[model samples]
Target: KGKNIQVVVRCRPFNLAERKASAHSIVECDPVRKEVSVRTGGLADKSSRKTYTFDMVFGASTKQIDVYRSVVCPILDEVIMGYNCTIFAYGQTGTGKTFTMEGERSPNEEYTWEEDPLAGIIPRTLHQIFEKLTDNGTEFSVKVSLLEIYNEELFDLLNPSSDVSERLQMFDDPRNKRGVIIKGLEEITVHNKDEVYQILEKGAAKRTTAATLMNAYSSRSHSVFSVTIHMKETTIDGEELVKIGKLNLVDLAGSENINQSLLTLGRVITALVERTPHVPYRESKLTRILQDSLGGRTRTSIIATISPASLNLEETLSTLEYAHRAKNILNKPE
Candidate 1:
């Protein structure tokens, strides 16, 4: 048994629009204390200040590499040890969720390590996995699946050629111990980094993106990039064992208001910690897909992204409160 869920907040730097409008940061992060302080008004006004504590807090000046190293490395460690791991990027539009998850895609549509110092968690995670496995000479097989949930409909991003009228169905696998199955989803086996990047680029092209007031190319749907690792191992008695681990990297849709998926996710968290008989995992496609991560036997980490601008106080506060509630959730991982 481990903690319910680990929550970390990251405040993104002012985007072009915010900077052009001269928006001031209403949020401040104290790295030493892993606390974030938010005020409704200017820095001089302390009357409406509130403090929140999380597992970790990354400020505007924090680098993507640092966040990945500190927040994601531990989860990867657990995943390599045959544990299911989930990392979620939760935030409102224009708060750098996409940037933190995908980073700046190069002209070649792959993560250019030399050009982008802010390469995101997803790319870096893949690199780390392959590098480690190769370095350690571990015999492992990796397969990936990318899917998007738009307007409550599930679409396989990797298989964009499929008809829009066609969508995946969710099924509960009671035999597998409360797990879920996404029928008709494609899981492509990848042997190297290049193949993985190619698949990612193809899937990303099919993701739902639209123009929003807050972001120019805002993600209109939630996308999940899941990687399953199968490793061959030998026991002390020379018996062979196949260890399977799954890592789910989720980039949630950016919402201007309280998102339904986020709301349902919150409900699930509440149900788990409150000892409610039924957890509402079926409330939304997003929550249903995350069934294994919410209260099940998985290691979960939530990366709550937020804007420090005073203009986004409403959205920022709501995001902070969600992360705060998630911080109190305790999960028993089997």
Candidate 2:
């Protein structure tokens, strides 16, 4: 490879509960009650308010770092260099997927606030892009492409009324073979953070969403919005060659117990879970499209978020087990 890859990790609390206890953001496990509490109600003693554990581990570090950090800065760095890159967030619904990407809108709808005001990875990353480009005074053209995967189909967030068939089509480019096949939507670029936010905000409204048994604001689909940069520059030798880079920010649909979400028969759901061995990734468009990223080269990571509380132990363990299995997957990058 003629390029460099970087990775970083960050963990942020995503608790949207509208209660005093919910505001503090605490991760606690009580064996006595056999229940794990995420931001449990306040204890009578007000002084102990700040004590808590983290529900999920988040953050980034290197080119080959774990999930949290992988999505943040490293991907941004590649975009500046004119190399195609994809950063995605995957986990159960309401696990901070949306907050990590576009962030939540403030009460006024005039502005958006981070679930944790201190650290919003996506916005923070976009800001750094402007700073880096300005300090060096580099001029680059950028554009954005926002799309969603609903019921295993693609939806252009910016052009919802456009031909669904076009958006829904799977794309395969022979020049780029990393194993994943995505929609051939044009990538968008921006000149500054404000522009990026404008595109992201406008696109968010057009995204497809549905209510699930897991989380209230559950995303019933997988969405990927990309920023593609066209950089034309003169090298140290004064040679000018146009280089292109793409930054793909993906928010995947949450995987849950179908029995719990669809209210399916317990035996059937159990059978479904047991069918992972036979679960055909090629059966769904989304899975087929992500075959490479999930099992390809070009650096990958999974944060595998979990809850410490005992009540969520089974689910948490299941997620971890999945991650463990994924670690063993051979992703022969092209």
Candidate 3:
């Protein structure tokens, strides 16, 4: 089927500092209309505004659970049907990209992190898969890997036994349809929701924490958490057929930096949208890693994160513009 990349806009709530400064909201989400109205006024109200349309829109007060149900659930169903699915959060730094993807711990003891109301897309998707696939097939297994691309180098976030600096290498895999693969990314197996949490916890412990590549590095780097499922189905012959499905949860670097991989990805998106002769996937490693998801067979969805505060208007519009153009990339899923 020929379908364009799914693009949605999510405006995050104001931060403490923004609230302290009494920041004015420049953006409003009409969830019912799937439109975003932005205050473009340097002068006054009403007519000094601009609005944009998207596949879906979620405002500041939207629930994390609602995000998953509306966005990830449809993609998750496709993944279980043996399709590769990817979800990407794109925006400026501190715009709730990580919060919407990895989420924060609930402060109360009343709810476990997995079951917490603040739980984000990653955990909820994992929980959903287990719930839906417990009685799936007689034999099925789920494996996960977390990869971080920092300054164009690859690091395995899920490999806790190694030093945080243990970098991985990628090589062209002509034998595979995806074209490239990480040399030593370890994929941890998960049997239940507990194991899933453990994997996430372990990965987070290594992901840009103190003493390693912390703080500023967090905003500069990108992370991808991938879960793959293998279900073995018995056949009439003395053999069995296995079906493989995968989902990738990607948190991209802040859109503020427009130089290397992020820039290359931006170029790639523009090229694909423009239907150019060459899409520039080879210009950056991030583009190479994401080659399949960008214009190839994988099912890709982009969550263009934005801030409602007037302080972030410029980047917010840029984010919306980039996401809007990406909606034209038609992928013929195999």
Candidate 4:
């Protein structure tokens, strides 16, 4: 089946500082209508607002689980049915990119991963997969890998013994045609939800974070957390088959330069939408790693996160347009 990529927009609530500074919201979300209305600035008329429609829209008040149910549940269902899936968050820094993807541990210590109100898609997805697969009672193996791309360099987040400066190499996997083989990257065989929590914790520690002008903890690197599920089955004819499914959860650089992997991703997206003869995936490691999701055989979805404050109107519109166009990209999934 060939389907267009799913594009969804999420508006984050105003922060205390933004409110203290008397900043007002320019963005509004209509979940039922799947529309985001933004105030058109630089005009004398303050009432001027523009509306953009997407596959789905989440308002500032929307909870974490609300997002997962509306957007992820069906896609994760497809992953279980043996289809590759990729869900990535795209936006500038301080716009809930990481918050939507990795989610934050609540300051209150009582919430477990499943019960955590602040838990993001990563934790929710991992926990739900274990629940679903365990109920199926099928012979299955789950493997996970975490890769971080920073300053155009690739780092394996799962490996603890690797040197701080030891980088990995990425190249085309010739046999699979659109596959990427990241040399030296470690893929851990994950068992039980408890084991995955530690794996997530370890990978979280390895991500590159620093105080940026936009946000204090904004990540400088883009992280791709992947999980592959392989299930063995015997047909009525007595032949054995292995159904392999994969999922990619990507949190991209919140803020971008030749060191700009985000720029390369932008170029790749432009190329894919334009159907250009030369797609520049080789120009950056992030694009190469995502080569399968954008235009290949993976079922792709993009969550475009934005802040409702009027302060971020320009970047907000940019994110909206980028995600909107991605809806045109069609992928043939088997």
Candidate 5:
């Protein structure tokens, strides 16, 4: 019962390869209008310019803190108020999707929030949540689960004892007001920020990534990092009730091969925007798992990332148009 989905665009600066080759950017952003313009030719060629407007647009010069504050802070505010919220990054390979979602970390080093100026959305979100809970004087418990969908199958990232090839099934939980559930998925209880960081580090190591022509460590699977927050509250009559909220941070694999899950997700969005009677949530595991976020009962935000190099013109345009279409989806959050 809220407004339409919030969509934003972010342009990544040219990578070292592009910089070495002196490649020029084909994308430009106007912060005042919250609009992004892309061109297929030189800066003087006005005929190739195309502009699209979004809730917000971030240029390559934007800082990580500013991006997080502008794009995710409001969503975090809603999640703290008992709303299920989702934030996902969409883009082509090498466009900084994983970097924006998970941030860069070293396996040998312990993570400290103050150490990295460019700490990504997931780490920053966790830090903010913990800090808020500490200040709010509320009794809260947090549970975390990480999983990846690879080759159309689900693998639990936290439970290494479980077979990597084993698949998890989705079901509805009547006790939770008929919300969706992932059967047999293991969730770890985290009491402090350090514990959460350790769990994330352990699970992230298991995510499937491989080298591709587009990216050195391209994500080959869709990775979902979920946090479930439960808080104890009292009513006017002193009746106790438990409030449950969930935040799902998803990093979808790039749009290189057009995987089955991505195809189904596209169809779901199309059906929702077109007002088609029969929506296909069951077409794929990813869509079924994200049914609430798509157009049902959750607050959703999509950050579309794009490369600034002219070599990535086609992929950048495709990614931009995809995000443009997602702007039309309207959701009713419960």
Candidate 6:
């Protein structure tokens, strides 16, 4: 059609603080405000930019699997239906993000523990894609690469963990298109659900995490799982016109005050956080890798997850405001 592509926002179910995880407590996107208003300052201020208005946020009452099905299917439809796309999850730690991304599969499934599918966004999305294709007697190929940026060094999320160092390895690729970033990494081909799940499991193991004052399971670094679609329309294209779509799933580390994190994590946390800004994408491998996705040509969707408790009000507001500013980032399509 060559018509201007329109970006669509879909809200997932959200669970606020009140009822917690009960069915009655959850809330769906309200018709008038499916997209959230990210403020820069506070209710009184107007400093924030790019308020990301989304179509969905899963609430407590929402069923975990059902919410995932609803939020992800449409994005897949857009890509499969003919649109180059990017979909990502952006939220503070401990907000069922991992659970939402990939459902909790029985650990005993034939896959070994090291290969256990990380219960979060990337794995689940792949599972749905495979199932849909298989049911229709069509076949498609997928490849994935995982990366994590911790304290300014880029570590393969599929590689073993190690202590952050000033001399860590790195690769920086700018996007060929306007707003996206390009990276120098290999995409491992995925043929079946098992293979995809195995990659997710291994990748998760390779991801780096550190505890903070706010939460013990806090992600001390940003983790990005990427899926590059290499598929032809199963019915007509027949692998001739491989319409490639990319999904960048990101889980950002908690934005904690260095002092607090140091107290919670001991002395090293202080020096680590202190040295973070210097890496400058080069500092930690994650930042350099995410430069494009966070500020490049790709059409990105950032879901800023939050803690609804009153105790988290300051940080929650700050996070929302940041996302609001992000909403305004306009990317030129290639």
Assess each prediction's global lDDT (C-alpha) against the native. 0.79, 0.48, 0.84, 0.82, 0.80, 0.49
TM-score of each: 0.89, 0.63, 0.93, 0.91, 0.90, 0.64
Model 4: pairs clashing at backbone N, Cα or C within 3 Å: none
lDDT of 1 by residue, 15-132 (tens): 7887898877788999899999988664554457889999899999998779878988888878888889888998997888888888875566454663466678877888888877
Give me the overall lDDT of model 3.
0.84
CA shift at 332, candidate 4, in angstroms? Answer: 1.0
lDDT for predicted candidate 1 compared with the true structure? 0.79
Q: What is the lDDT of residue 282 in candidate 4?
A: 76
Error of 5 at 74 (Å): 1.4
Q: Candidate 4's residue-wise lDDT over 1-334, tens digit each?
A: 6888889998988888887998778888888999999886854354788788999999999889998898888998899888899999988888898889889888768777778989889889988888887775467888999887768777777776764366788878988876788888998998788897888887766544322211332457788889999987554566666788899999888742134778888888888889998888778888888888878888999999988877788888888888888888888888
Candidate 6 lDDT by residue in tens digits, 220-241: 6555677777666555544445
Question: Which sections of candidate 5 miss by over 4 Å?
Answer: 42-47, 106-111, 172-179, 208-218, 233-241
Worst 10 residues of 2 by lDDT: 258-267
Lowest-sum lDDT 10-residue window in model 6? 1-10
Top-scoring candidate (lDDT):
3
Q: Which regions of candidate 1 deviate over 4 angstroms?
A: 42-46, 106-115, 160-165, 208-218, 234-241, 258-260
| The best candidate in terms of TM-score | 3
Candidate 5 minimal-lDDT segment of 10 residues: 208-217
The clash count for each model shown is 2, 28, 0, 0, 2, 46
Candidate 3, clashing residue pairs?
none
Which wins on lDDT, candidate 1 or candidate 4? 4
lDDT of 6: 0.49
Query: What TM-score would you give candidate 5 relative to the actual structure?
Result: 0.90
Per-residue lDDT for 55-121 in model 5, tens only? 8899998877887788878888788789899999999988888878877864556645545766888
